[PDB]
């Protein structure tokens, strides 16, 4: 344990410049955005993967879901798999993957079932653990407890002032506690997360 709270960041193209070495002191893990649906890979995916690999920061990937159901769900799962492969092509080694499911684009069907199809596909293709992210309220109102996956990543921001505020109303493994973090290494607001030491170990690949 520590007098300092465990700190995990998540970043995307919205953090176009990051002093990666400047994260090493306080940050235990970083999750980077892989892709938005089948529309695009995140524009900073490779930059961030290379930057984190450079300094030996353990990291993972999250996919922002936009799937329609059916084959599109699988095609989106393949975006995340492809992003994972792209990182490995650059020599980097992500240790955890995530489905970020916080809006619904399904033409028909059930959110739990389609999230499950996505997660099963990614796990089956890669052998890497795959967790699930959503805000507290969205998670409850879409029955996300019924999805089987490897890590509950739950957002609840409270006053959203860069420091921990209101906790999620449901159990969590990783808690995204603000979207307005301030750290010297990143000019832009950044999402900040915390978790137990056991969950940090899990993120890092056990």
From TrEMBL:
Superkingdom of origin organism: Viruses
Name of the protein in its database record: Gp26
Species whose genome carries this gene: Listeria phage P40
């Amino acid at each position: 344990g520590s007098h300092m709270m465990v700190l995990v960041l998540d970043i995307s193209k919205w953090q176009p410049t990051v002093n990666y070495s400047g994260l090493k002191e306080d940050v235990g893990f970083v999750v980077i955005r892989s892709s938005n649906g089948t529309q695009k890979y995140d524009e900073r995916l490779e930059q961030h993967a290379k930057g984190l690999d450079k300094v030996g920061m353990p990291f993972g990937l999250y996919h922002y879901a936009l799937f329609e159901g059916g084959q599109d769900t699988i095609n989106e799962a393949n975006m995340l798999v492809s992003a994972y492969k792209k990182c490995r092509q650059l020599g980097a080694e992500p240790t955890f993957l995530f489905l970020d499911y916080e809006e619904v684009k399904l033409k028909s069907g059930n959110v739990v079932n389609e999230c499950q199809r996505f997660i099963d596909h990614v796990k089956g293709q890669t052998g890497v653990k795959v967790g699930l992210y959503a805000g507290d309220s969205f998670w409850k109102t879409h029955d996300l407890d019924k999805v089987k996956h490897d890590l509950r990543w739950v957002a609840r921001y409270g006053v959203d002032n860069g420091k921990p505020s209101t906790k999620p109303s449901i159990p969590y493994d990783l808690w995204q506690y603000t979207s307005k973090g301030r750290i010297k290494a990143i000019a832009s607001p950044v999402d900040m997360n915390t978790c137990s030491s056991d969950i940090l170990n899990k993120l890092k690949g056990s």
